[PDB]
Amino acid sequence: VPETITGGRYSLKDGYYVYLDKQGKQVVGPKNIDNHLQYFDETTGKQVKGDFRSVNGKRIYFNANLGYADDYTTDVAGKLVGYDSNGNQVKAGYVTNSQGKTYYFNNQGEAIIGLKTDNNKTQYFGPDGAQVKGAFQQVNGKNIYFDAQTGYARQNVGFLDGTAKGFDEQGNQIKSGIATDLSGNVYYFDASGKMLTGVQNIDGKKYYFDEQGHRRRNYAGVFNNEFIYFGLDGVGQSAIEYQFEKGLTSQNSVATSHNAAKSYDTKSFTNVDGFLTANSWYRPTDILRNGTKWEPSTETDFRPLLMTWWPDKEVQANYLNYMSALGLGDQKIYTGASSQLDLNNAALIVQEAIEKKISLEKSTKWLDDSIKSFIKSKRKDIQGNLVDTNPGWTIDSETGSTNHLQNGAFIFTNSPLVPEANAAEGNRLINRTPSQQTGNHISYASQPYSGDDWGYELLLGNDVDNSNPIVQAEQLNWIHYLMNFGTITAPQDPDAHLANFDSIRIDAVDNVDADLLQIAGDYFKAAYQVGENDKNANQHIHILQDWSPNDVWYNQQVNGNSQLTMDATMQNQLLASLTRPITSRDSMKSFTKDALLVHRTADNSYNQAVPNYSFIRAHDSEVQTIIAKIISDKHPDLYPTVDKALLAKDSALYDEAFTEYNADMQKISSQKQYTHNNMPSAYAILLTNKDTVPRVYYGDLFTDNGEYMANKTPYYDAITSLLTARTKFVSGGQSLSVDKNDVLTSVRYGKGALSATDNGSSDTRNQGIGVIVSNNPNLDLNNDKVTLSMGISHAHQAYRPLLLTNSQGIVAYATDSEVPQNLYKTTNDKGELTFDASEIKGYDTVQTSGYLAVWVPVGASDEQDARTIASTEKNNGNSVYHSNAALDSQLIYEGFSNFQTVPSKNASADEYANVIIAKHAADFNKWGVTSFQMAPQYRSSTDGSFLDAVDTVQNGYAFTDRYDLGFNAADGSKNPTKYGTDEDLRNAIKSLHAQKTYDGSSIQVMADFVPDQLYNMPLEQAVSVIRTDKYGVNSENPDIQNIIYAANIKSSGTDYQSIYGGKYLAELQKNPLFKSLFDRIQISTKKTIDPNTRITQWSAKYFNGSNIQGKGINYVLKDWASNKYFNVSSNDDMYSRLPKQLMNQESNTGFIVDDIGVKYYSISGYQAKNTFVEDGNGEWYYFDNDGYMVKSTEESGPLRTVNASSKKYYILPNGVEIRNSFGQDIQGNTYYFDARGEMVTSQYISDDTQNIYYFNNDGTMAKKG
């Protein structure tokens, strides 16, 4: 029996492929994988490809490609018999040889020769048993074509031996009949097999065939002195006879006096900056009260606009149907074809029911809902699928680039139609990432390091413009508010000064103007004199979220080191070499490469390395992506891509995924299908490393979901043992190594000593840790020995373990006395430890793959602390921080996860995280924490536009009011954020501040500074928009070029932004210490910061752009004839006046034939001037400056420039402007006209049937033959 293997990937060794087991081991012999049987060689473990092996007796062939077992025919004599994939002979069925020959065998097992007439699909087989595909074969002069993929007879035209000969399925030449090629080309022949070109009459219907014989669609031109237009049918339509309904329909009714608007100004209409939308309501002069008596309307008698007016018949019809479905309208179906007068009468029948329902309910809220759902309603199509009923008012119409986290984006631009949503000149500078701050990319990177930039301006939601000086100021104000949160929010309290934040984490560095880094750096020199010395600097440790490789070096040269850069090379190497499964895993020798940021192979100096903070996981990185992977595997239907699974927001899915994620964390390393292996081995390297500030993720001590701090991970004992050990032993110089067996040994020599040869100080002897790490579950040393080279400072010294590994797990020893006598071992005269195979071997537990050990020196006191005090001396150079003993004494703790359960409305006091933080304050001080990175404390949105904004998470990165950190409601209801109230928060900070570290100063508390975006904003505003991707590159959709959009982009002006916005700028300017900050010329703007305007209400002029909101392109209402937007707040001529019916004026709609020409009036009653106009969802027409339709004549040909934009259109004598269509001169030349109706030049245009034509710069088609 070939065993089935399931988990494990393929590898390439020596130019052949091998398969690695879940255990880690190469597989040998005949084995099933992927449901297809493959063989693997006895010694080299090599996969067999295109050879013969014997799996349990029977002779089996394996594919040249993929390695899978397959069919084969061997001809010893006569006809080869042929064999199934699993051995055995074929009694009656197809097999395909490796050469690609396909034979069919009879019941007797001989190869079938000649014709093979199956169950309704005749086939052929030539002599020698091969099937024929893709050629014509005369069985007996039939000349029957056989398909390339299947040997089935097909109708096809064969250009051999003459031209245009057509043959059918049974193989008769199709004289006087229609024939069809493989590409779908349609020929027509005459009696005696010769094809036809030009205009033909087939069944009282005209068709056009070009010069190579193809019957054609969407082709216009004069033929035998008759202008014909052959449509999608291929059928000729008269281009003289009009294609529109002649005659006008009055929109004046008995009811229009009463439904006319009370007034024609802002008073009577609900509006967005004057513009009207689909959800607009208005006050008619009269109300049909209880559907029985016309009364004068009161101040509160507003009704939906859509009740009495619509932008066209198509929406009118659909409205009537939808309300009829809600049981209000009449029981009968209407269409855009249906007559105008009938729709208007039907609408008045609906109104009667609407008002009767309002009288009954004593409310109009039910109506508001049913109008909102009508706008977003869906419908059956001719295909049978769900489309949108009103595409113009949905996401459907906002098509562009997909490259953005929320599937689209806009950029705000200026435009004279919306004067108040226009930004100043030289603002809205996008993509000023650290790399592109000057406006051009600059590689600051040196020789073996990368200098790329993965930044982009539009990340999420509504994107704030941080190239505006007024905004840059409000960002400074917000920092000041946070650094003085306590004193500001609770002035009555005497201890308010203890409830203040100390440092910040700058979020989305690659998505905002990099000027904000220098602004922030200036603040802390002014306020807290961080520049003076290490002591001051290290009391405020800030961090960057700077993912791009180049940002490390930008930070160093441009930004001083005003914030700490992340180490990405370490995180990546720690993930690659330890966390991955055995199949994907990098070697430990990689830790000694050159492309690492900090070389630790012989780190022996201070103030040389780049100041940095390194980590393994974080609330976003390597957390959410793993959950998504599980969602994808469990629900392929809904989410097939790992990227697609990130977009999911349903809690049931996550709940399901987490129970797996939690259950998988418990499993042994070899069967960890989703989670990270070797977590304690990774943290063992991280927390012992020199020249770095380690950051520990909440979710590695505790479970990423559920109650805060409630459930521990498998790794808690190991990691908390390391953290306290860091406090007592880790100091001095470092050196990594990796022996021939691939076993890492990290050594710290202890305070005073910087190398192995250093004799050190008094402090040295009892300090300095030693770490051993292998990532090989099948490690077997045998004769070879592993060596920990401690210093000569540690010669002839007794050492005891801190961590060791068993099959059961990892043993942590807290004190020397907990250690058994046998484990103790003493160093030799050189300061070396030696390890046997009887000691160090391969393991596979839950907590380790390979082996982990950590050894410390025996006889440390309890007062012993390895950490070093910050220097007070002046520092030279430009770095704010300096990577040395004192900085490495610091340690950050990211004390939150996204997926912490959200305490319910009536949750008890101590379910909220900030209460729990206070209770466990001393726990953090015993782990060596000097900075506590709190979550963003801002009130989260719940609209679900992104993971961070769904109600089950509310992590706080998705916020509307960024001065609101959990304040009470207006009535005095406690109203906490996911983590607790402003009071609960202020305590938590005091609690952390009460804790005192090794140097007697408090634990720092870090605010999460999020300058990039704002979510879910209350008030609409009109803006000009262009459809783009995340970089702000124009996706160049014609309909979305500087059009007007009703964006939710304006704050309420009664929120905490209005209270505290820019409040402290005046005050700061007056301070001398801040003079440097305000005088600085910022790199990107080249202008100074501007603190003279306060931002109390956010508005569209302070934003670069926004993610797509799915209001729709035509959500802002607009008369099609005039092609102007409706505006109530202005009496300007660039806006259209209200539809004539709504101001009780005479109004008519329709086409009107006139002696001079043809005029068209919209549903609103206005005349079409200088506009394209679609009719009855079919034909387009253009109307000139004089309000007359443009039509071609005999004197003036069909090819015309109409708009004076140098753009040429093809217009028939109907006035019909043909689109996606070919057109002809009277001379003979052919032109093609694209989706938009305009002529094509210098371009190949493809054809539905795979024909291709080339059109010159001229516009004319290149003729063929």
Ligand X SMILES: OC[C@H]1O[C@H](OC[C@H]2O[C@H](OC[C@H]3O[C@H](OC[C@H]4O[C@H](O)[C@H](O)[C@@H](O)[C@@H]4O)[C@H](O)[C@@H](O)[C@@H]3O)[C@H](O)[C@@H](O)[C@@H]2O)[C@H](O)[C@@H](O)[C@@H]1O
Q: Are 10 and 29 in contact (CB under 8 A)?
A: no
Which residues does residue 1161 pair with via DSSP β-bridges, in sequence order? 1150, 1167
Q: How far is CA 309 from CA 286, 301, 369, 1045, 1065, in A?
A: 15, 17, 18, 21, 50
Q: Which is nearer to ligand X, 68 or 674 (by Cβ)? A: 68
| From Pr ion, Ca ion, ligand X, none, interface partner of 601 (C-beta below 5 to 8 A by class) | none
587 binds, among Ca ion, Pr ion, ligand X, none (CB under 5 to 8 A by kind): none
Judged by beta carbon distances under 5 to 8 A according to partner kind, the member of ligand X, Pr ion, Ca ion, none in contact with residue 595 is none
The answer to the question of residue 1012 lying near Ca ion (CB under 5 A) is yes
Q: Tell me if 35 contacts ligand X by CB under 6 A.
A: no
How far apart are alpha carbons 743 and 738 in whole angstroms?
5
463 or 522, CB closer to Ca ion?
463
Q: Give the shortest CB-465-to-Ca ion separation in angstroms.
A: 8
How many binding residues for Ca ion (CB under 5 A)? 5
Round to whole Å and give the CA distance between 910 and 916: 6
Shortest distance (Å) from residue 544 CB to Ca ion: 15
| Residue 758 interacts with Ca ion (CB under 5 A): yes or no | no
Closer residue to Ca ion in complex, CB, 239/512: 512
11 binds, among Ca ion, Pr ion, ligand X, none (CB under 5 to 8 A by kind): ligand X
Check residue 10 for interaction with ligand X (CB under 6 A): yes
Site for ligand X contains 14 (CB under 6 A): no
Nearer to ligand X, 69 or 320 (CB): 69
Cα distance between residue 359 and residue 668, in whole Å: 68
- What residues numbered 322-361 form the site for Pr ion, per CB under 5 A? none
Nearer to ligand X, 55 or 953 (CB): 55
Closest-CA residue to 584 (of 673, 506, 519):
673
515: contact with Ca ion by CB under 5 A = no
Which residue's CB atom is positioned nearest to Pr ion?
A: 1177
Name the nearest CA neighbour of 1232 among 216, 218, 236, 232.
218
Shorter beta-carbon distance to ligand X: residue 34 or 818: 34
Closest distance of CB 46 from ligand X, Å: 11
As given in the structure block, the two tokens for residue 564 are 């700490």
Return the amino acid letter for 89.
Q
Q: Are 1149 and 1162 in contact (CB under 8 A)?
A: yes
User: Which span (8-16, 120-128, 174-182, 666-674) binds ligand X, by CB under 6 A?
Assistant: 8-16
DSSP 672-695: -SSSPS-HHHHHHHHTT-SS-EEE
Judged by CB, which is closer to ligand X: 39, or 456?
A: 39
772, 840 contact by CB (below 8 A): yes
- Note whether 13 binds ligand X by CB under 6 A: no
**Applying CB under 5 A, which of residues 195, 512, 804, 1065 lies at the interface with Ca ion?**
512
Query: Residue 66 binds which entry of ligand X, Ca ion, Pr ion, none, with Cβ cut-offs from 5 to 8 Å by kind?
Result: ligand X
Of 64-72, 477-485, 528-536, 1193-1201: span binding ligand X (CB under 6 A)? 64-72
Alpha-carbon distances, residue 303 vs 351, 355, 1119 (angstroms):
10, 10, 21
- Residue pair 164/179 in contact (Cβ under 8 Å)? The answer is no
Give strand ranges (E) for 790-924: 798-805, 810-812, 825-826, 832-835, 851-857, 892-894
Partner in contact with 1198, chosen from ligand X, Ca ion, Pr ion, none, beta carbon below 5 to 8 Å by kind: none
Told to check if 9 binds ligand X by CB under 6 A, we report yes
Query: Of Pr ion, ligand X, Ca ion, none, which one does residue 12 interact with (CB within 5 to 8 Å by kind)?
Result: ligand X
Per rule CB under 6 A, is residue 16 in the interface with ligand X? Answer: no
12 part of the interface to ligand X, by CB under 6 A:
yes
- Binding partner of residue 463 among Pr ion, ligand X, Ca ion, none, CB under 5 to 8 Å per kind? Ca ion
Query: Which residue(s) pair with 846 in the sheet?
Result: none
Q: Is 457 in the site for Ca ion (CB under 5 A)?
A: yes
- The count of other CB atoms within 10 Å of the CB of residue 392 is 18
Least separation, in Å, of the C-beta of 38 and ligand X? 6
Which run of H or E residues covers position 380? strand 378-380
- Distances in Å between the Cα of 632 and the Cα atoms of 580, 627, 949 are 19, 9, 21
**Which of 463, 522, 567, 1055 touches Ca ion by CB under 5 A?**
463
The 40-59 site mask, x for binding ligand X (CB under 6 A), equals -------x------------
47's contact among Pr ion, Ca ion, ligand X, none, with CB below 5 to 8 A by partner kind, is: ligand X
Q: Give 33 or 1047: the residue with its C-beta nearer to ligand X.
A: 33
Tokens of 894: 């990211």
Among 144, 210, 214, which Cα is nearest to 178's? 214
Least Å distance between CB 580 and ligand X? 11
Phi, psi angle pair for 673, to nearest 5°: -80, -30
Query: Which amino acid makes up residue 158?
Result: G
152 interacts with, out of ligand X, Pr ion, Ca ion, none, CB within 5 to 8 A per kind: none
HSE value, Cβ hemisphere, 13 Å, CA-based, for 477: 28
Which C-beta is closer to Ca ion: that of 47 or that of 511? 511
CB of 1177 to Pr ion, least distance (A): 5
Pick 546 or 1217: Cβ nearer Ca ion: 546
Residues ≥6 apart with Cβ < 8 Å to 1027: 398, 399, 400, 401, 408, 409, 410, 1034, 1035, 1036, 1037, 1040, 1108
Kindly state the number of chain residues that form the binding site for Pr ion, as judged by CB under 5 A. Answer: 1
Backbone angles phi, psi at 294, to 5 degrees: -75, 110
Report the nearest approach of Pr ion to the CB of residue 1176 (Å). 5
The helix or strand, by DSSP H or E, that contains position 96, with its residue range, turns out to be: strand 94-96
Taking CB under 5 A as the rule, which mask of x and - marks residues 1160-1179 in contact with Pr ion?
-----------------x--
Give exposure, 707-741, as e/b (b: 16+ Cβ within 10 Å).
ebbeeebbbebbbbbbbebbbbbbbbbbbbbbbeb
CB of 190 or CB of 1154, closer to Pr ion: 1154
In the complex with ligand X, the residue whose CB is nearer, 37 or 989, is 37
Which CB sits closer to ligand X, 2 or 1213? Answer: 2
Handedness of CA 409, 413, 417, 418 (dihedral sign): positive
In the complex with Ca ion, the residue whose CB is nearer, 1013 or 1260, is: 1013
Under rule CB under 6 A, residue 17 binds ligand X: yes
Interface with ligand X, residue 547, by CB under 6 A:
no
Alpha carbons within 13 A on the beta-carbon side of 1028:
21
Which is nearer to ligand X, 27 or 305 (by Cβ)? 27
Please say which residue, 829 or 1155, places its beta carbon nearer to Pr ion. 1155
764 binds, among ligand X, Ca ion, Pr ion, none (CB under 5 to 8 A by kind): none
In this structure, are strands 1252-1255 and 409-413 parallel, antiparallel, or unpaired? Answer: unpaired
User: Are the C-beta atoms of 155 and 168 separated by less than 8 Å?
Assistant: yes
Measured between alpha carbons, how far apart are the two ends of the chain, in Å? Answer: 65
Which of 811, 1152 has the CB closer to Pr ion? 1152
Tell me the window of 63-71, 379-387, 676-684, 746-754 that interacts with ligand X (CB under 6 A): 63-71
Residue 17 interacts, among Pr ion, ligand X, Ca ion, none and using kind-specific CB cut-offs from 5 to 8 Å, with ligand X
Among residues 35, 65, 782, 861, which is the contact residue for ligand X, using CB under 6 A? 65
Tell me if 868 sits within 8 A of 753, measured CB to CB.
no
Residues that bind Ca ion (CB under 5 A): 457, 463, 511-512, 1012
Positions in the binding site for Pr ion (CB under 5 A): 1177
Binding site for ligand X (CB under 6 A): 9-12, 17, 47, 65-67
